[PDB]
Ligand binder design. Sequence first.
Ligand code: GTP
Ligand code: GTP
Ligand code: GTP
Lengths: 438, 438, 427, 50, 46
Amino acid sequence: MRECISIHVGQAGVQIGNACWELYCLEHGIQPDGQMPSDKTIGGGDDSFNTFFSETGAGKHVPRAVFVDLEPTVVDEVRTGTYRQLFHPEQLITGKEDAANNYARGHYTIGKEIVDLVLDRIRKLADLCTGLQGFLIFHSFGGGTGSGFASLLMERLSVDYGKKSKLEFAIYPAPQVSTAVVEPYNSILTTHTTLEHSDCAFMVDNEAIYDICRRNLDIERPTYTNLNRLIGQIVSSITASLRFDGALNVDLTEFQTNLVPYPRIHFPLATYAPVISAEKAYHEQLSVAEITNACFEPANQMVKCDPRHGKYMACCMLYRGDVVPKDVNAAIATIKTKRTIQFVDWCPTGFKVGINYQPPTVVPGGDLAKVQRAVCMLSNTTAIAEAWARLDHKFDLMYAKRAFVHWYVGEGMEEGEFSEAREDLAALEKDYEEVGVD
Amino acid sequence: MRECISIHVGQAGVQIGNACWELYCLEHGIQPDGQMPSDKTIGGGDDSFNTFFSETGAGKHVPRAVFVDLEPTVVDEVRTGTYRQLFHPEQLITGKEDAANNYARGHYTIGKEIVDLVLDRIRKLADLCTGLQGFLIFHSFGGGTGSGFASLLMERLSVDYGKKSKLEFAIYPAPQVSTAVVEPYNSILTTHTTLEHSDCAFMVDNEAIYDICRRNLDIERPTYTNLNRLIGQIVSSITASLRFDGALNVDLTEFQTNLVPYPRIHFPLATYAPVISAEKAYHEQLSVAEITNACFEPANQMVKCDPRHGKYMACCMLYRGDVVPKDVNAAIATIKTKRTIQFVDWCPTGFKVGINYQPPTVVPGGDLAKVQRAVCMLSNTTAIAEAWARLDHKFDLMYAKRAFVHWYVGEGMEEGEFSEAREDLAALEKDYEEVGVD
Amino acid sequence: MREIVHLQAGQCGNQIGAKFWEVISDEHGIDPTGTYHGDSDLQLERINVYYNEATGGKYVPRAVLVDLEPGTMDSVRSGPFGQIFRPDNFVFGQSGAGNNWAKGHYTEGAELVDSVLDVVRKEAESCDCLQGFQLTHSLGGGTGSGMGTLLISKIREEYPDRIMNTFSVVPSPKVSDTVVEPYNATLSVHQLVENTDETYCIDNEALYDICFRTLKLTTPTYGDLNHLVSATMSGVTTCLRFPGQLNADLRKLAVNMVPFPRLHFFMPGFAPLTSRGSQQYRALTVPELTQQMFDAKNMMAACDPRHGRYLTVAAVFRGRMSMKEVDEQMLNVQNKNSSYFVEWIPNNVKTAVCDIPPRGLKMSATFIGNSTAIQELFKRISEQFTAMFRRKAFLHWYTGEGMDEMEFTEAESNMNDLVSEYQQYQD
Amino acid sequence: RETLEFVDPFRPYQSFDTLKRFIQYDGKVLRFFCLWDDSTSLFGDRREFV
Amino acid sequence: TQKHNLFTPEPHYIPGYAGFYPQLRYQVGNTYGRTTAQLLTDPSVQ
Ligand SMILES: Nc1nc2c(ncn2[C@@H]2O[C@H](COP(=O)(O)OP(=O)(O)OP(=O)(O)O)[C@@H](O)[C@H]2O)c(=O)[nH]1
Ligand SMILES: Nc1nc2c(ncn2[C@@H]2O[C@H](COP(=O)(O)OP(=O)(O)OP(=O)(O)O)[C@@H](O)[C@H]2O)c(=O)[nH]1
Ligand SMILES: Nc1nc2c(ncn2[C@@H]2O[C@H](COP(=O)(O)OP(=O)(O)OP(=O)(O)O)[C@@H](O)[C@H]2O)c(=O)[nH]1
């Protein structure tokens, strides 16, 4: 049936995946013990959880996700958390050594002896699955262990399974903030390796996530908890179609068909319009018009891109809650009448709507609003090529002065692969204006 | 009727027989005294024990086994144990002198004056028995007392009783671990003596039993108590056909006919699929598919052989518990669809299934799981010859430099018998080859 | 049932035999008077391997004492356990030794060998079936060397069917005190290698080095040295007397350690030795036991086998261990120094694990070594013999006794044959 | 499913024993004194048994 | 040492064991049981 498997590689990607399952157990009302109250939803594992959890005759929900990391500190800590009884011990694949931010160390030195184990997990999860539309991969481009390990496993799952979908989600590197200077080194290594195998990649940047927090959420001092709950809401919204239904039901297969124009570039942008603090939503009203203005207001994007400097290709909107096609179609029509919205002439239509009646729920101990009508806005524009334009002039300098190469060549590589990525990157930009130029 | 006699030779083979009888009384609920409660099961010796125990009008269940040993240390201690009242005193056949690992010392020096005694025991056991399908022999190859004494007695019981089955079970010598350098001496001596008389020799290796313990049982420091329990479960599963019925009932005679293809080679491999920890089985589910995957997973074999380096001839699975033909026949059909498992083209069908309804129970103070569906996997493959291939290149070096020969020629022997066995082995590998050649 | 009768010889054996036996009584908890205080059931089963029964729960040690000088026995008798030894088992002579080996081998032994044979067969008939015998003495010990060579030869044709152990201490290489000692040792070893099968090699200098290393107590008593080696000697005997899944018979052991007949000489090895504060500074783990077990410093027998290679190794572990750690420890050391063994035989290890700890500690062990480290020993004595045989020093005595230089020729030639034999097998 | 509960084999059987009670009450006899009237017949009157 | 015990109050000790049994020197009796019946009956020393 309609189920999937999630992947969370790296200490970066494990705390966020933890929050998602924390959120996911909430709307399903899953108790931290592992079982419901005297009410009956258990069986052969076939209900709203059959797509996410695995609650067999034992009555314990087994989430369909694998957490892999190379350092035991955080994973053992969450192994001592609140839902650890729910979590499968060796689905929480731990490690004893790190990649030291080195792409190839996590790709050559240690990834060999651990991938065989996780493949057993994948196949032993594959057999119990029925339809398994695809995979939910959560990582980070600046992965000290997320980057290198994922590149190894993603091609391994691609070569044996090239018939099903693979969904990619990672933090985009901060355009002007760098907590690591080898991060641009490994990031371009991941991109050029993933471009020919990654199906649909989606990125996000924390700075504007922070910027939103003190703009409208009005929190000048949030924490990761807020960051994880926001993206957890994002993945919840895209997965609500799997959980509930609405006016029309849409699937990732429709998303991949209706978003990516051509091969290579598969990098659209997600956005959630009703990001507002609580105290506001009491005394104002929400409707499709303003949130449509909000989701298309450029400053509400979490990626530092000026859409006026680019051109729109596709726009996929997922209205979760009580909406009607009438105001929807009328409002988006006014958007089409807008002149500043410069779509490419190649797309007469570029709108992909998915309706779900279920209202978005608040989280206990949270800071969000009380949303009845919500949209997660998925779109791809040509204003993104500047981001890679930032990386290459960042990249070309240090490669020319070949910093830290002694580290990389010290444990066994050469610069030719670093050479390949540069025209792999270069081919990306030249393509972007070529498709950008009508 | 459906009964058998068990034989336990070697102070190595004595503790395992104790554990099996310890296990055997639990599913029968036998109290250590020797009698059930006031409930009515005693009689002329006819109930579930009749195939194993001898609970006559005296009301005391007498196991149909013979413990034979030559060092009174362990046998006296177990005679001070818990069920010693159940055990028959001179059925606990003891000796006052050892064989010093020497096969022929245990085959010539002292075995002559004791075999007549045990011969009296077997006939006095034979007369009381009714059908006595065959014998159950626990022994060892590298036996300080297991090797030499068993060889003489199996010669004597074969010539007078050559019309019934004899079931052989010995710990296979560890390939790269050696507790004694004379172990190759007696081991190949035993093999060449047994090949023309032994009916069904089944081998195990402790290393992988240990390897299993910290893979899935997750015990880094187990003991023999666990080791004997694991093999004790194995013999329990094969004997469950005698204890209970099933969807179909299978017997060693069917096992003998359907397993061994051709004379000489009668050396299959056994494997128990649901070996897992209590908590793992607690929040996980067992079904025919994944356990069928597990039993054919190469690392789950207790013998260090790669089936991809060999080819399959016979495969017997003994499903114990609540199972149906539907999933089982479909699963094995999918197994036949698998390409990696390379059966020989000679056998289109090589799958012998024995269904038993009785679920495998847990043991008090044990480490096993709560199994409802279990299978004992008996199979024979050509990947076994590497073991003897390992054996011979160890022997050929050592026989060339004739180490320890003064020990053997000192107490009565020569080199011809040692010479004779090596071409027997050299026959074994060459016989193992053309059968592997299609 | 299979038992052992002990032979006490030499004036060194006078001290070790007392120390060796009192440890056993203390280990089994018998009071000095001899009335057993029932505390341990396993020792309540297995003193019959070594002791017979006296009236009133008294346990006669089945050992025989032999010497010439009465004062040594009187000190032994006036010891803490002289009462538990028998005046029946005290055979001696009416002569002073002067540790002329020939006198004890030809002159003094003749009128005493008859009596000692009578006593031992009386003891031998008192018991049912032996594994065999063991002897405590010194190879360079004058009166002990003279008597044993006679006794070992006599008991050869007597009972050529039993376990024929020998426990001798090597004199100090740096100084032998006795200057005719190299004559005494060379004479004895000629017949020893003919008559013996097992030989323990012990040297005092190494024991002196051990005291400087772990005992660290400046000035010890020779009894403390006797305490160490008696414990090692007791350890190899613990395996017989105690239960647990480990194989006990020395023949179970000897065939595994002895590849060729001429191999009789063996190097002991013992387990944790602890210093001033390390009792409360040590975490007892099989890894650190295994490390300390295979330490050239922990060695005490002859000298460092580092200069050579390892033929056979056998270590018995005493206490609450398991089959897995001993297995992985053997693999670790197997991989640790793979080259330092001989390519003739791999997996040259023979492991036994005694589940019963000693009284006071839980995890202990003992090791017996057969490596290429004995060459320098008889190489050392080779120069001494040749130098002293170069100009027949101190020789008129033995000619007066009735000895001739021809005997000395084959004794060294026998020794020289061993030099090539040990060399040829490894080098 | 009671038919499928009927499809649930357990292999039962039963037998007996007499030794223990024999041993328990070995060498034990009860003794009582009684009377039967025979005067109903015109020949005999009475007789006493134990 | 740190261990457990044996020689539980008779009747025990099936014939066959190897070992000395305290004050076994006055076996005017005949059976293995009767001896052991009295032997453990006599811890009277202290
Ligand atoms: N996904 C994620 N990223 C975070 C989070 N907090 C900070 N980051 C950023 O994500 C990056 C983490 O990547 P890595 O440091 O390479 O993690 P790793 O590959 O598993 O290896 P390590 O260096 O040992 O952590 C950091 O550079 C941070 O800038 C978070 O909560 N989740
Ligand atoms: N069957 C069995 N084997 C064991 C056990 N524990 C260890 N072993 C192995 O089995 C071997 C025993 O063989 P032997 O030593 O010749 O045993 P034996 O012939 O009865 O005579 P002994 O020398 O007294 O033990 C040892 O080398 C161990 O490696 C056990 O509990 N059962
Ligand atoms: N008892 C004893 N013997 C020692 C000691 N130190 C070294 N030895 C040597 O142990 C040797 C063996 O003793 P015996 O065989 O009884 O000596 P012996 O035959 O009586 O004659 P000598 O060797 O000349 O004393 C002696 O030769 C001593 O040199 C010690 O501290 N105590």
